[PDB]
Write an enzyme that holds these catalytic residues in place. Structure first.
Site, mmCIF file in Angstrom:
data_model
loop_
_atom_site.group_PDB
_atom_site.id
_atom_site.type_symbol
_atom_site.label_atom_id
_atom_site.label_comp_id
_atom_site.label_asym_id
_atom_site.label_seq_id
_atom_site.Cartn_x
_atom_site.Cartn_y
_atom_site.Cartn_z
ATOM 1 N N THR A 1 64.883 20.775 95.647
ATOM 2 C CA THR A 1 65.640 21.965 96.004
ATOM 3 C C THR A 1 67.111 21.833 95.610
ATOM 4 N N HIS B 1 54.369 23.385 101.895
ATOM 5 C CA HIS B 1 54.254 21.988 102.291
ATOM 6 C C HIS B 1 53.119 21.801 103.300
ATOM 7 N N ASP C 1 63.598 27.995 92.650
ATOM 8 C CA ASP C 1 64.165 26.700 92.314
ATOM 9 C C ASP C 1 63.106 25.772 91.702
ATOM 10 N N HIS C 2 61.835 25.934 92.096
ATOM 11 C CA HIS C 2 60.753 25.063 91.654
ATOM 12 C C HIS C 2 59.414 25.609 92.152
ATOM 13 N N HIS D 1 56.520 18.567 95.857
ATOM 14 C CA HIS D 1 57.132 18.939 94.592
ATOM 15 C C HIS D 1 58.226 17.937 94.249
ATOM 16 N N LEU E 1 74.784 11.873 74.351
ATOM 17 C CA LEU E 1 75.709 12.265 73.300
ATOM 18 C C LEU E 1 75.784 11.134 72.287
HETATM 19 C C1 LIG Z 1 76.695 18.751 79.801
HETATM 20 O O1 LIG Z 1 77.889 19.506 79.967
HETATM 21 C C2 LIG Z 1 78.972 18.758 80.546
HETATM 22 C C3 LIG Z 1 80.132 19.717 80.719
HETATM 23 O O2 LIG Z 1 80.600 20.221 79.466
HETATM 24 C C4 LIG Z 1 79.327 17.573 79.654
HETATM 25 O O3 LIG Z 1 80.213 16.759 80.414
HETATM 26 C C5 LIG Z 1 81.545 16.608 80.042
HETATM 27 O O4 LIG Z 1 81.614 15.591 79.047
HETATM 28 C C6 LIG Z 1 82.945 15.218 78.636
HETATM 29 C C7 LIG Z 1 82.770 14.118 77.610
HETATM 30 O O5 LIG Z 1 82.015 13.025 78.148
HETATM 31 C C8 LIG Z 1 83.780 14.766 79.835
HETATM 32 O O6 LIG Z 1 85.137 14.556 79.402
HETATM 33 C C9 LIG Z 1 85.867 13.444 79.822
HETATM 34 O O7 LIG Z 1 86.676 13.811 80.938
HETATM 35 C C10 LIG Z 1 87.439 12.720 81.499
HETATM 36 C C11 LIG Z 1 88.173 13.270 82.705
HETATM 37 O O8 LIG Z 1 87.599 14.503 83.168
HETATM 38 C C12 LIG Z 1 87.960 14.862 84.477
HETATM 39 O O9 LIG Z 1 88.124 16.278 84.575
HETATM 40 C C13 LIG Z 1 86.916 17.062 84.432
HETATM 41 C C14 LIG Z 1 87.330 18.520 84.436
HETATM 42 O O10 LIG Z 1 87.253 19.155 85.746
HETATM 43 C C15 LIG Z 1 87.873 20.415 85.763
HETATM 44 O O11 LIG Z 1 86.982 21.476 85.415
HETATM 45 C C16 LIG Z 1 87.647 22.758 85.250
HETATM 46 C C17 LIG Z 1 87.581 23.078 83.773
HETATM 47 O O12 LIG Z 1 86.222 23.201 83.322
HETATM 48 C C18 LIG Z 1 89.105 22.729 85.778
HETATM 49 O O13 LIG Z 1 89.558 24.076 85.941
HETATM 50 C C19 LIG Z 1 89.246 21.982 87.109
HETATM 51 O O14 LIG Z 1 90.619 21.642 87.310
HETATM 52 C C20 LIG Z 1 88.382 20.719 87.153
HETATM 53 O O15 LIG Z 1 89.072 19.597 87.696
HETATM 54 C C21 LIG Z 1 85.950 16.696 85.548
HETATM 55 O O16 LIG Z 1 84.760 17.475 85.419
HETATM 56 C C22 LIG Z 1 85.610 15.215 85.480
HETATM 57 O O17 LIG Z 1 84.810 14.866 86.617
HETATM 58 C C23 LIG Z 1 83.811 13.897 86.490
HETATM 59 O O18 LIG Z 1 84.032 12.815 87.399
HETATM 60 C C24 LIG Z 1 83.973 13.152 88.816
HETATM 61 C C25 LIG Z 1 84.137 11.853 89.575
HETATM 62 O O19 LIG Z 1 85.207 11.064 89.057
HETATM 63 C C26 LIG Z 1 82.658 13.873 89.173
HETATM 64 O O20 LIG Z 1 82.750 14.378 90.503
HETATM 65 C C27 LIG Z 1 82.365 15.014 88.203
HETATM 66 O O21 LIG Z 1 81.061 15.561 88.450
HETATM 67 C C28 LIG Z 1 82.446 14.512 86.776
HETATM 68 O O22 LIG Z 1 81.419 13.542 86.573
HETATM 69 C C29 LIG Z 1 80.567 13.591 85.472
HETATM 70 O O23 LIG Z 1 81.279 13.289 84.256
HETATM 71 C C30 LIG Z 1 81.755 11.926 84.153
HETATM 72 C C31 LIG Z 1 82.545 11.824 82.864
HETATM 73 O O24 LIG Z 1 83.926 12.125 83.069
HETATM 74 C C32 LIG Z 1 80.553 10.981 84.209
HETATM 75 O O25 LIG Z 1 80.993 9.633 84.059
HETATM 76 C C33 LIG Z 1 79.824 11.153 85.535
HETATM 77 O O26 LIG Z 1 78.657 10.334 85.579
HETATM 78 C C34 LIG Z 1 79.423 12.606 85.748
HETATM 79 O O27 LIG Z 1 78.275 12.918 84.924
HETATM 80 C C35 LIG Z 1 86.879 14.347 85.430
HETATM 81 O O28 LIG Z 1 87.441 14.194 86.730
HETATM 82 C C36 LIG Z 1 88.380 12.139 80.434
HETATM 83 O O29 LIG Z 1 89.044 10.994 80.988
HETATM 84 C C37 LIG Z 1 87.603 11.747 79.178
HETATM 85 O O30 LIG Z 1 88.495 11.301 78.140
HETATM 86 C C38 LIG Z 1 88.352 9.988 77.679
HETATM 87 O O31 LIG Z 1 87.615 9.979 76.454
HETATM 88 C C39 LIG Z 1 88.305 10.544 75.320
HETATM 89 C C40 LIG Z 1 87.322 10.597 74.176
HETATM 90 O O32 LIG Z 1 87.873 11.299 73.068
HETATM 91 C C41 LIG Z 1 89.521 9.687 75.022
HETATM 92 O O33 LIG Z 1 90.180 10.191 73.863
HETATM 93 C C42 LIG Z 1 90.456 9.709 76.219
HETATM 94 O O34 LIG Z 1 91.555 8.814 75.996
HETATM 95 C C43 LIG Z 1 89.725 9.325 77.516
HETATM 96 O O35 LIG Z 1 89.603 7.902 77.627
HETATM 97 C C44 LIG Z 1 89.840 7.300 78.866
HETATM 98 O O36 LIG Z 1 88.731 6.478 79.277
HETATM 99 C C45 LIG Z 1 88.521 5.270 78.500
HETATM 100 C C46 LIG Z 1 87.302 4.578 79.072
HETATM 101 O O37 LIG Z 1 86.558 5.434 79.939
HETATM 102 C C47 LIG Z 1 89.777 4.404 78.553
HETATM 103 O O38 LIG Z 1 89.574 3.209 77.799
HETATM 104 C C48 LIG Z 1 90.945 5.202 78.002
HETATM 105 O O39 LIG Z 1 92.144 4.427 78.027
HETATM 106 C C49 LIG Z 1 91.124 6.476 78.815
HETATM 107 O O40 LIG Z 1 91.560 6.174 80.164
HETATM 108 C C50 LIG Z 1 86.755 12.926 78.694
HETATM 109 O O41 LIG Z 1 87.560 13.984 78.176
HETATM 110 C C51 LIG Z 1 83.751 15.829 80.927
HETATM 111 O O42 LIG Z 1 84.392 15.359 82.101
HETATM 112 C C52 LIG Z 1 82.321 16.216 81.293
HETATM 113 N N1 LIG Z 1 82.312 17.262 82.299
HETATM 114 C C53 LIG Z 1 81.446 17.363 83.319
HETATM 115 C C54 LIG Z 1 81.521 18.630 84.118
HETATM 116 O O43 LIG Z 1 80.643 16.477 83.602
HETATM 117 C C55 LIG Z 1 78.094 16.763 79.262
HETATM 118 O O44 LIG Z 1 78.433 15.836 78.239
HETATM 119 C C56 LIG Z 1 76.944 17.650 78.784
HETATM 120 N N2 LIG Z 1 75.735 16.884 78.553
HETATM 121 C C57 LIG Z 1 75.013 16.904 77.424
HETATM 122 C C58 LIG Z 1 73.849 15.960 77.363
HETATM 123 O O45 LIG Z 1 75.278 17.652 76.487
HETATM 124 CA CA LIG Z 2 76.662 8.317 73.782
HETATM 125 ZN ZN LIG Z 3 63.340 24.057 96.960
HETATM 126 ZN ZN LIG Z 4 60.011 21.792 99.512
#
Ligand SMILES: *[C@@H]1O[C@H](CO)[C@@H](O[C@@H]2O[C@H](CO)[C@@H](O[C@@H]3O[C@H](CO[C@H]4O[C@H](CO[C@H]5O[C@H](CO)[C@@H](O)[C@H](O)[C@@H]5O)[C@@H](O)[C@H](O[C@H]5O[C@H](CO)[C@@H](O)[C@H](O)[C@@H]5O[C@H]5O[C@H](CO)[C@@H](O)[C@H](O)[C@@H]5O)[C@@H]4O)[C@@H](O)[C@H](O[C@H]4O[C@H](CO)[C@@H](O)[C@H](O)[C@@H]4O[C@H]4O[C@H](CO)[C@@H](O)[C@H](O)[C@@H]4O)[C@@H]3O)[C@H](O)[C@H]2NC(C)=O)[C@H](O)[C@H]1NC(C)=O
Ligand SMILES: [Ca+2]
Ligand SMILES: [Zn+2]
Ligand SMILES: [Zn+2]
Ligand SMILES: O=C(/C=C/c1ccc(OC(F)(F)F)cc1)N1CC[C@@H]2CN(C(=O)NCc3cnn[nH]3)C[C@@H]2CC1
EC number: 3.1.4.39
Length: 805
Positions: free
Chosen positions: A159, A265, A308-309, A419, A688
């Site tokens: 769900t 269920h 949902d499912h 489910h 990716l």
């Molecule tokens: C499915 O679709 C989704 C969505 O499009 C795809 O996911 C996206 O993928 C992007 C690429 O992987 C990823 O970009 C990251 O972002 C990093 C920081 O991002 C933060 O901000 C995000 C934005 O939130 C805002 O949203 C709206 C706008 O839409 C705004 O209005 C609001 O203000 C919001 O704040 C935010 O979503 C993100 O949150 C994640 O983390 C939270 C906990 O910390 C979670 O609660 C949340 O759910 C998110 O978690 C998911 O994503 C993370 C990945 O970030 C993942 O690990 C988790 O498991 C989970 O799945 C952030 O808070 C940013 O730092 C990244 O940049 C690095 O890489 C670039 C590469 O070019 C470098 O150039 C750059 O320097 C940087 O490097 C840094 O890190 C290095 C090592 O890690 C380090 O060495 C270096 O020095 C640097 O420090 C990059 O841009 C998106 O965040 C992500 N979005 C979502 C929603 O998940 C997904 O790929 C698609 N899937 C498929 C299969 O296609």
């Molecule tokens: Ca990859």
């Molecule tokens: Zn359900």
């Molecule tokens: Zn159920």
């Protein structure tokens, strides 16, 4: 602790939130025990039922009633839903014929058609047909609106993940809600159904529709409803909100039902006790459509009916126990049920080995009703790996079964349905109907994934979607009018078209080929092949576009054509057409070890055979199969170092069978197929493509990277009375992403002939073209006669190999 000394006077279901310590009057207040003392009195009246009787019309108003039949109730916007019917001699919505809705018929002051999302838990896809006789309101929606035979949920088919995926367009791995129950190792906390922890905001990622709305100036009704609030009240509340003045009135609304999941269920999916829950849904839908007709909104509002499912037959006796496989059972935590997730009970223990847990769970009984994976080895179509909340060890459970830890967990039987299984399973499929002015009239659409809806709901509301995993444009065929015209992404890297630049003797690869045997007619003609004189036979949909900055070469041959990466030292893609009339040949005796250097590509940007010799774990294979060469002469092209890819022997078994038998078979069944194949690199299992500096594995003592997976896309004419290579109309496609694995422990029949187990593995690893595009950074189907919208739909299709729903 909250001082609740305030009152709900005038605040029943107020839309914005007043925080502690002042008492609340919203449909969420119960869940915090923060409702004002008089909430039940004023906001949850129940007196006199939910229906006008004949002997209540034109009555005097009495505020204690649940709804009203008084002459002024239309104005106050709080009539019962059957007020017009009984009192003013009107007909129920369901009993009228459906006229097409060519334009919004909205009353003055309505700037945009509202959206009502009517969500129902556990509404299995096959309920629409098997229950049609007792769901007349919903059958009107379906038949006059836009429906799909079914809609595919996300894994796991639970769900919370599915409701939040519906609201975000995101995979669970991205939005963070990866189960109904979860443990976060950084937080040291559990997310559960019963309890308050699930309320903290730190669990929920992404941007759900109501936040997307609010931030762009579209106001929203609230989405959550308390359990104790009965459905009839929920509808009257939506109808009251719609009476609010123009500048107070939400544009998007949600309704939710615990049914039919709740009963499912207890009684299973089709137990006789399921007819009644279904009757009640229909009744509820009836009250809404009646109520909308009362407000002149029934040809103004768009309604989504979505589940949902689904639901499956599951019982206690059909439980596998881990205590019959493992000795060391008290050293693990299991998250049980229709899916297993295992982790160490204590992170203080150094001797905890997942390799050995998986060993003990692999093919250990002929019965076995589940299969262990390491999460990165799960089928990529499940997209269930990239989150710290998902445990490294996972159990894919067979439909109809459960997994538990010990027998005591199951007795310390009751239920008949559950489910959560794999999302391509028939019983787990759910419903979509859209009805209103923006949706189409009496129109059926193909099945689609639920990740796609966020985009559409934003479109219905003139919103701009937050980044999501939908493919925006792929559902334009649902709508009467579109605000999103999708456009092809621009190619980032243009290729090189190299000619003959190198002599044999410049290559020192350690590769032999017996190919020294000796015309102006047929020697002028094979130069033409290397310029691409037969490129429009083997490359039917234009060349893939590379969407990242890299250096690659286009290589032409008689039988096939490739884009060769100078960085990864192998093709990104290989393209070829196999007609129905084509014949399979074998690798002749004298060419079994043959690997020829390619004189268009430098020694330094080539693989070498010496690495393959020295690495005892790693062999090699070919992307274009030598087995399907058009002639003995062309077969030599297939042994070029630039058609070569690294392959574990175990995986050569799988691959060989695919190339030798299956391609020809498909070419027979589908009147020829176009095949594109290549490598995928995803060591960080984020779905990716990985860049050069993320490669975790090379062939020993070389810069030759090792694919984590291998893909193929197999296209043909949907009208199969037309050859693949001369298709006038729509296309038909199937794809897969095979894990490149050193063993075949995933297939418990692997010691038998390839004809028993290989095609079964490939079905499990079915995939969307879009899934491959994410992992490769390529873009396919650039040159067709077909509209781009249709092509998006094509790229999102998944071949499920299931029976008919
Ligand atoms: C499915 O679709 C989704 C969505 O499009 C795809 O996911 C996206 O993928 C992007 C690429 O992987 C990823 O970009 C990251 O972002 C990093 C920081 O991002 C933060 O901000 C995000 C934005 O939130 C805002 O949203 C709206 C706008 O839409 C705004 O209005 C609001 O203000 C919001 O704040 C935010 O979503 C993100 O949150 C994640 O983390 C939270 C906990 O910390 C979670 O609660 C949340 O759910 C998110 O978690 C998911 O994503 C993370 C990945 O970030 C993942 O690990 C988790 O498991 C989970 O799945 C952030 O808070 C940013 O730092 C990244 O940049 C690095 O890489 C670039 C590469 O070019 C470098 O150039 C750059 O320097 C940087 O490097 C840094 O890190 C290095 C090592 O890690 C380090 O060495 C270096 O020095 C640097 O420090 C990059 O841009 C998106 O965040 C992500 N979005 C979502 C929603 O998940 C997904 O790929 C698609 N899937 C498929 C299969 O296609
Ligand atoms: Ca990859
Ligand atoms: Zn359900
Ligand atoms: Zn159920
Ligand atoms: O009112 C809601 C939300 C409504 C909603 C409507 C539309 C949405 O999305 C969008 F419109 F955007 F599509 C999203 C959410 N609630 C209350 C009930 C609880 C208890 N609850 C359960 O008891 N589930 C039963 C179950 C238990 N195990 N399997 N099934 C699950 C949980 C669901 C959340």
């Amino acid at each position: 602790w909250t001082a609740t000394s305030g009152s709900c006077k005038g605040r029943c279901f107020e839309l914005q939130e007043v925080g502690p310590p002042d008492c609340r009057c919203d449909n969420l207040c119960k869940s915090y025990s923060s409702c004002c003392h008089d909430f039940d009195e004023l906001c949850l009246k129940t007196a006199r039922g939910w229906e006008c009787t004949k002997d209540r019309c034109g009555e005097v108003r009495n505020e204690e009633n649940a709804c009203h039949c008084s002459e002024d109730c239309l104005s106050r916007g709080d009539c019962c839903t059957n007020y017009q019917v009984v009192c003013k001699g009107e007909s129920h919505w369901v009993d009228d014929d459906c006229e097409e809705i060519k334009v919004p018929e909205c009353p003055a002051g309505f700037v945009r058609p509202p959206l009502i999302i009517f969500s129902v838990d556990g509404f299995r896809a096959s309920y629409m047909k098997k229950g049609s006789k007792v769901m007349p309101n919903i059958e009107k929606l379906r038949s006059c609106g836009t429906h799909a035979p079914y809609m595919r949920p996300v894994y796991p088919t639970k769900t919370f993940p599915n409701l939040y995926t519906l609201a975000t367009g995101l995979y669970p791995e991205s939005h963070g809600i990866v189960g109904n129950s979860m443990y976060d190792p950084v937080f040291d906390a559990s997310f559960h159904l019963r309890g308050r922890e699930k309320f903290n905001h730190r669990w929920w990622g992404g941007q759900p529709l109501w936040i997307t709305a609010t931030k762009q100036g579209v106001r929203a009704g609230t989405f959550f409803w308390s359990v104790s609030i009965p459905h009839e009240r929920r509808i009257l509340t939506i109808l009251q909100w719609l009476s609010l003045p123009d500048n107070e009135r939400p544009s998007v609304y949600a309704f939710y039902s615990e049914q039919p999941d709740f009963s499912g269920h207890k009684y299973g999916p089709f137990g006789p006790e399921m007819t009644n829950p279904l009757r009640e849904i229909d009744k509820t839908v009836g009250q809404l459509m009646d109520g909308l007709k009362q407000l002149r909104l029934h040809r103004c509002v768009n309604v989504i009916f979505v589940g949902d499912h689904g639901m499956e037959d599951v019982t206690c006796d059909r439980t596998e126990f881990l205590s019959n496989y493992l000795t060391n059972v008290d050293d693990i935590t299991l998250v049980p049920g229709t899916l297993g997730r295992i982790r160490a009970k204590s992170i203080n223990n150094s001797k905890y080995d997942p390799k050995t847990i998986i060993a003990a769970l692999t093919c250990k009984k002929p019965d076995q009703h589940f299969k262990p994976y390491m999460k990165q080895h799960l089928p990529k179509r499940l997209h269930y790996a990239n989150n710290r909340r998902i445990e490294d060890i996972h159990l894919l459970v067979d439909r109809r079964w459960h997994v538990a830890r010990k027998p005591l967990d199951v007795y310390k039987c009751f239920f008949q349905g559950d489910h959560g299984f794999d999302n391509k399973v028939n019983s787990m499929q759910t419903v979509f109907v859209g009805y209103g002015p923006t949706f189409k009239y009496r129109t059926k659409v193909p099945p689609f994934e639920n990740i796609e809806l966020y985009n559409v709901m934003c479109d219905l509301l003139g919103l701009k979607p937050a980044p999501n995993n939908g493919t925006h444009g792929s559902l334009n065929h649902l709508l009467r009018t579109n605000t999103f015209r999708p456009t092809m992404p621009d190619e980032v890297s243009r290729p090189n078209y190299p000619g003959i630049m190198y002599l044999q003797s410049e290559f020192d690869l350690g590769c032999t080929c017996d190919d020294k045997v000796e015309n102006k007619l047929e020697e002028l003609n094979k130069r033409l092949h290397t310029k691409g004189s037969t490129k429009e036979r083997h490359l039917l949909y234009g060349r893939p576009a590379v969407l990242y900055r890299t250096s690659y070469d286009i290589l032409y041959h008689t039988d096939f054509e490739s884009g060769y990466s100078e960085i990864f030292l192998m093709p990104l893609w290989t393209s070829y057409t196999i007609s129905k009339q084509a014949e399979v040949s074998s690798i002749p005796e004298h060419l079994t070890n043959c690997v020829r250097p390619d004189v268009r590509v430098s020694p330094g940007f080539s693989q070498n055979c010496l690495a393959y010799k020295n690495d005892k774990q790693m062999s090699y294979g070919f992307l274009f199969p030598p087995y399907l060469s058009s002639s003995p002469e062309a077969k030599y092209d297939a042994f070029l170092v630039t058609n070569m890819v690294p392959m574990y022997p175990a995986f050569k078994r799988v691959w060989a069978y695919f190339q030798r038998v299956l391609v020809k078979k498909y070419a027979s069944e589908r009147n020829g197929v176009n095949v594109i194949s290549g490598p995928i690199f995803d060591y960080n299992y984020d779905g990716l493509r990985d860049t050069e500096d993320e490669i975790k594995q090379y062939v020993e003592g070389s810069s030759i990277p090792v694919p984590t997976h291998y893909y193929s896309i197999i296209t043909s004419c949907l009208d199969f009375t037309q050859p693949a290579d001369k298709c006038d109309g729509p296309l038909s496609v199937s794809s897969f992403i095979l894990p490149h694995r050193p063993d075949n422990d995933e297939s418990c029949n692997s010691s038998e002939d390839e004809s028993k187990w290989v095609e079964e593995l490939m079905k499990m690893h079915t995939a969307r073209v879009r899934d491959i595009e994410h992992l490769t950074g390529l873009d396919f189907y650039r040159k067709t006669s077909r509209s781009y919208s249709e092509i998006l739909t094509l790229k999102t299709y998944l071949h499920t190999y299931e029976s008919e729903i």
